[PDB]
Amino acid sequence: SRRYDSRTTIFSPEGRLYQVEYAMEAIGHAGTCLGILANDGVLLAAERRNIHKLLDEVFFSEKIYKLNEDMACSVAGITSDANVLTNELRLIAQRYLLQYQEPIPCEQLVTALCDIKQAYTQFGGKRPFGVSLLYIGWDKHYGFQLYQSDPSGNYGGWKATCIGNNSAAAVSMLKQDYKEGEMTLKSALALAIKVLNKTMDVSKLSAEKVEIATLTRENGKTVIRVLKQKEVEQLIKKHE
Amino acid sequence: TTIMAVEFDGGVVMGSDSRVSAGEAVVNRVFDKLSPLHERIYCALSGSAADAQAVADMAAYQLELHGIELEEPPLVLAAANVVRNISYKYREDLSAHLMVAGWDQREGGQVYGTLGGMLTRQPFAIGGSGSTFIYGYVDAAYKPGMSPEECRRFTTDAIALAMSRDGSSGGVIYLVTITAAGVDHRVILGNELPKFYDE
Amino acid sequence: SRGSSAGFDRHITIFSPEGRLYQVEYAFKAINQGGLTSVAVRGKDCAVIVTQKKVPDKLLDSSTVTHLFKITENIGCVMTGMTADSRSQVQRARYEAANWKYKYGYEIPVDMLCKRIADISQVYTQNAEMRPLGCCMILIGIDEEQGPQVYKCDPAGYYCGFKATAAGVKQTESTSFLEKKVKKKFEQTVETAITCLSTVLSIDFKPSEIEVGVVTVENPKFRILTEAEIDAHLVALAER
Amino acid sequence: SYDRAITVFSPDGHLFQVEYAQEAVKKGSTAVGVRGRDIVVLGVEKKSVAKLQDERTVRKICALDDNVCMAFAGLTADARIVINRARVECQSHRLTVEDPVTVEYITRYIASLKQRYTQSNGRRPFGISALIVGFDFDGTPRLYQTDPSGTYHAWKANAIGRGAKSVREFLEKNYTDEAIETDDLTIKLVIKALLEVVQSGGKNIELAVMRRDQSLKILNPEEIEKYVAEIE
Amino acid sequence: RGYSFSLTTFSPSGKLVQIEYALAAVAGGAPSVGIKAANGVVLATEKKQKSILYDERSVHKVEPITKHIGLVYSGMGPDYRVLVHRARKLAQQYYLVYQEPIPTAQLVQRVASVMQEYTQSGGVRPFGVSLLICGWNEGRPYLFQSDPSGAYFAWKATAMGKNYVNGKTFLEKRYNEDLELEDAIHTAILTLKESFEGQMTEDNIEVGICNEAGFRRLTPTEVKDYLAAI
Amino acid sequence: DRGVNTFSPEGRLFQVEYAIEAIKLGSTAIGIQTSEGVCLAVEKRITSPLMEPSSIEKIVEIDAHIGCAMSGLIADAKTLIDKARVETQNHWFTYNETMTVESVTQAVSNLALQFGEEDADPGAMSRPFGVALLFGGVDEKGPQLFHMDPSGTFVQCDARAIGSASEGAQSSLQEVYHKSMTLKEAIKSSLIILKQVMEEKLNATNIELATVQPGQNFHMFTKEELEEVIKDI
Amino acid sequence: NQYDNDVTVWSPQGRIHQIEYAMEAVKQGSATVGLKSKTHAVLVALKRAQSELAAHQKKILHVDNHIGISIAGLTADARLLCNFMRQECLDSRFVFDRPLPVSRLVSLIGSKTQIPTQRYGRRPYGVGLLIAGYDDMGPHIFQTCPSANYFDCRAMSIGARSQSARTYLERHMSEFMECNLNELVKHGLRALRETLPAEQDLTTKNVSIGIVGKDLEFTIYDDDDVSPFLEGLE
Amino acid sequence: GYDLSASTFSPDGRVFQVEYAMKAVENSSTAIGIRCKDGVVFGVEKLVLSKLYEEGSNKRLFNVDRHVGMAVAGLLADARSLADIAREEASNFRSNFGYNIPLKHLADRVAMYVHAYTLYSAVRPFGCSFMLGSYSVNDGAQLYMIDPSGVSYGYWGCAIGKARQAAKTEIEKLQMKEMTCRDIVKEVAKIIYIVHDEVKDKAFELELSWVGELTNGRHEIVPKDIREEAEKYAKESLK
């Protein structure tokens, strides 16, 4: 019996959780995903891997899920685990809306989930979720927000970041090309198509190889919108 | 409700009236109060008809598992021990009464009484609300060593008496004779109930 | 591939590099431990199951060394392989029949019985702690609708309908001969079963060395043919 | 449930999982504290400047109550768990005693918790060392260090995280009653300490401040850099 | 009591090796094919039938889940029976709770979840089946493919099991968006017919159709008719 | 790899042997029993001047008459100390009397072989306590010092040295101890042996000292008292 | 090497190595010898002293008015199983209002120690007991072992070097039904002293004697108490 | 190897733990029973391992119920545990069904119980065989022999332990269908004195029992006079 236990909740001889870092390898092989935090809105841009075949595209997007009235999340890596995490986040935020009669801020939601991923990473011996998540959501305390969480349960707020394939080149291009507090929504669109153009080595970028959904404010209500294909071709053509 | 059983040499005879009344208006004027628990073990229901039915069904289930697992017909003593256990374990929740009767290779005909969760073999084990009106008749007309026709006409007479006096009992009188050959289900229509002093 | 093996694939029910389950396949190697061979075939009127019966010790009470097991008043059963596992599936199958009768108010059809039992062997072929019950249970029963029924469930969870079959060491030659006869067409049926089995064994059986079960349309109750009647069919075989 | 014994002795008497967790702390972002006359300062190294980064949500210096705050280092998620449990337990203490928790109470609590997960079924030890600083109701300053092994201590000023050897050497050399006579000498003590280990001292490992009977006070990054030029 | 730790652990490369292997098992399964027409969906799967002894009408691979949903698989049979009973359970819970036929995207979400739960739970292997769920409602066709890893893809037309690569390349050149249902069935049966190896009959290939009238299996007579003209 | 409940080829649990080796790394503590009461002195082994000396408390109170010295995994002994405290106080509540030392060391000694990895209804203890305690106290039977170890065996001892240098020191205990010894002689003697064994130069900071006398409750000697006793060196 | 890690692994020879290694524990324990006469059931224990200053660990444990034990091996296991035995006897004198017969007691202990000897991840009790008990059937001396087996003995000696004591007890077992109390205890002390190294000697310290019989509830005699019984022994 | 737990078939399909446990039964001392016209008899080659043990130590003839006897072998503690399980079985059957349990159903239940431990790595097989005897006016004498695998077979003559083969060759010398208990007892005695390898493992006891007509179906150990006349005759047949 003890021969069979993989012991997924133990440290190494140098203090590195092998399952969490191997998971970071898996998400390391996932499709790149990046969003940017701006003043007038927030956009997410994810390389799709449903590229192109006899797929049907029955859904509105691939890696963008809607979490409450006021938030959106992008996963990367293990698709199924991303499903479980999304369902769990919806359950959390709706329990907060039951128990407080207001939307849940992004920080509280991310912490509630990241306590879960940490919980698997610590005991129970289950494998950790190999699914990194980028969040976007508005709240009346702190404004537009971007939260990156990873399999280890650690998370942080960012102004624009990229997770997945070529994440290093993506964050590099953001460091070279992000104007803090001065990026507009359209400036964010242009930069995002810049980074995704340079990173995605499959080679000529199409409207089919990515999707982008943007969140802004409109009349005391938050709008979570995905970009139609015409706008994507328009913005890539503009990028040319 | 007036169910009755009798023990004779080759087997038994389980008479029973065929009315179930709701208060003062009847709900069912034909209802077989003899549901088989096995091929040759009938239980005469009474009291809470729903409760009696649930007990007959659960008892039939256990008696069938125990029946097949031994690969031999379950003795009536077994059956009245399972219906006795299920009638005793729930006695605060079931107003049931099940004069379980039958046949078996090892003992021949039997009629066990199981009111309130007890177990007592008896020659004739009458029950039901109408049974409180025929103790006189059965005591005056029961002689041990009854041939089968004597048992059948006997219980028909007795339940006839109970039906004439009791309001909780009316309709037809079912009779089954359980022996080594098998069960012989019979019915007594209201035009055939032997007439007694009517005034 | 081609017999490749990695880690604990050869120890528990997990997929080897090829995709096989070595524990289930070994279990099929385990039905050959009993050293027996059983057969069931069905004609339009009845379904007959004939088996070996090896009583070597002479102290064995021959009344209890039997692979026929009355499952209900209408459902036959012939085990094969390891013995005690066969006993256990007989108890579980009997419990299934009594429970179907209690909850659903009628005799469990053979298809739903053998389906259910196959569902209870699959659970062994998926969980990692318990092994698969090494015993291929064959059933025979007369449904009022489809008629004579013979279904074979094995440690792999499979099961199917059969116009004939065989289980045990000589399943190969048995099924070969039954091919050679079904392609050449059932009233006697029993003559077919004993002819096939005695052929693949080449024994010229004696009336005590085997057993026979029959469930006929005219007689739903599963029943066992004694050594006298099996003597009748055998002697009816020798005299042609 | 998973009930394997993860933490078990080895053939020297060592608990290898504990030594490994302390390994994880030794790669944590270096933190330091000091205990002054009426002030208690904590410094958390830099951690991850990353110009796109958000400052507020990547700090290591959370509040445990009105009078109890804590740094840490190592597996930051785990420390988020311990911080959470300690907060709920502080409030349960105010429910059952009406008195705010002494620093000894909450620290000995968390030390108990870390000790339990060092010694239970299917649970790895926490990879966090927490330097909980706070003020007893009498107002005395309090520094308690808690490591994954669960053993805790009072401290004058102790450093945790990577390179805590050299920094602890620093406070061994420079902690004097002249050093903590005033506020600014105290804070220039802390930042003067980490500056041996904080790349480009000035605006990296910003800090935190708590005054007697005053809620936690935090930088003030520009004010970190004033001290930066003041020491560099 | 049973093993509580996951048996599927991230290999040092980070790709879940058990799901690679399980996908190899489905890759060896009997070939299946599904194509979505404009008004419905076809399901046709190859019977890897051994000896003629088999009562072929005894069990079917294309089982209905409600009046409007189907299933075909590729790989391990008994595992498939598990997922079928689970799916019937789920659609029935949905029908009790909301009083509506379960939309197929939903059912594939839940059954995809159940296929995921065993890539992570204690001491269970992942499934070894790749489902094809075809469904009709809102006047629209649906065809999803769930894998052992739990993820589900929405497809126009697909193929799985033995030789699924040549199957998919066969569909890329032969699927057109305006294909009516019967000509769809013709295209699928041709697709299997590319690598059948055994001279298909109305006994050894199954055909399922889901249209506005609901889902059902085509009796071997009708399937024999479609096996005409080929 | 093997379990926690495995017996070696010699007949001892592995985890109790490796644990009793783990106690060998702890700081040496020593206490001595006399007809006047029992004393307890333990080396703190301060690691850095930045530490608070009053932080390391290896001689803690279990009740008004039972002082519990320890040595080894100081973290583990917290569950033992709290166990004993809850025990003696529940004993006082129920039975309205102080609890004997043998009763306490026996109770708290029941949680030493209570470890496993398959029964585990809670997440119960997954390894033996890496603690060697020395419950000292006085009752109606008078002064008594009960050793205890990870293996759960609690034994009455006249005077015992436990920890890193406990062997040599124990040789000093059999060398110096005699039944008619007076308690101040006990304090002086034990401090002499610790001064023999300690690596660092002895002082009144990196040790502690407690005693429990027939009329005196448990008491920890402060700095000045320790210095006054170390004036004899 | 690959069979000696678990209790639930049958060797190729059909033995459970962990159980045998468990009996090695009682074989290392300090020697304790019991025996019985027509009327008395005597125990005799050498209380090991770890250090010269340390006191000899107790080997005898009151179980009830008529039953006493003598452990040898893992002590904490001994107090666990002793707590179980005590709970049994108290429950019997509670419900049935009569002292538990001894043989039923050692049967309960047998089924108790048998459970972990067959379930994975448990370990056999490494405590080997002698139980003395008087009831209506006369005095009793049961031996129990890590294998959960129990014995009914005329006189048995467990502990390190116990084989000598069992040798002597074979030399003189035929006399034990007739011996009075004192002569009996003399036999026990002699056979127990057969185990120790030659130079070292029985004293009032390292010996304990718990006697129980017809007219006597079970009673344990400590260091000064064995004086009367601890005399002569040439 | 491939033999580290029962839940692991070898490449040839043999749960090595059950076979090993059978090798544990085969190292123990042989016990035999013989069903005959009117009941069943049991002998027990109960090797006494030292002169210290009481006459009657380590009995291997139990009483799982008043109409059923039980002779065991092998690792004896496991035999006791089967005693508790079986006793709970017959008790449960008398409380459920109100009469003495048919022995056949009792060896079904117990056989499923032993079999319950050859499927999991979490537990090991019972390393012990045993025989059950019973007599009743309704079914006569019956003898079932569970082994570590859990399989239940009815025997006219049985033998379990180390000298099983020689005891079988001895049992086949009998017309046990045509003998009564009081004559069976002698022959079982002769069997145990013959099969016992004397020069190796000397000093056993003979511990007999029957259940049948003369005991009114009540399983009880043999009278000492009958056991001693039996040993006398069997030893005389050795000569």
Numbering used by the authors:
A (entry chain O): 2 to 241
B (entry chain F): 1 to 199
C (entry chain R): 2 to 186, 191 to 245
D (entry chain N): 2 to 233
E (entry chain P): 3 to 232
F (entry chain M): 9 to 241
G (entry chain L): 4 to 237
H (entry chain Q): 6 to 244
What do the authors say?
To identify the binding site of the compound, we used high-resolution cryo-electron microscopy and single-particle analysis to determine the structure of the human immunoproteasome in complex with PKS21004 (See Experimental methods). The final cryo-EM 3D map had a resolution of 3.8 Å in which the secondary structures such as β-strands and α-helices were very well resolved. We were able to unambiguously assign the density in the substrate-binding cleft near the active site of β5i to PKS21004. No additional densities were observed in the active site of any other β-subunits or in any of the α− subunits. This result is consistent with the conclusion that PKS21004 specifically inhibits the activity of the β5 subunits. However, among the human β5i residues interacting with PKS21004, many are different from their corresponding residues in the human β5c. The side chain of Met45 is swung outward as compared to the apo human β5c or β5c in complex with CFZ to accommodate the bulky R1 group in β5i. Kinetic analysis indicated that PKS21004 inhibits β5i and β5c noncompetitively with substrate.
The degradation machinery of the UPS, the 26 s proteasome, is composed of a hydrolytic barrel-like 20 s core and regulators, such as 19 s or 11 s, on either or both ends of the 20 s. The 20 s core that is constitutively expressed in most cells (c-20S) is a stack of 4 rings of 14 α and 14 β subunits organized in a α1–7β1–7β1–7α1–7 fashion, where 2 copies of each caspase-like β1, trypsin-like β2 and chymotrypsin-like β5 active subunit are located in the inner β rings. I-20S is expressed in cells of the immune system and other cells exposed to cytokines that are elevated during immune responses, where the active subunits β1c, β2c, and β5c in c-20S are replaced by β1i, β2i and β5i, respectively. The i-20S serves diverse functions in the immune system, including the provision of oligopeptides for antigen presentation, T cell differentiation and proliferation.
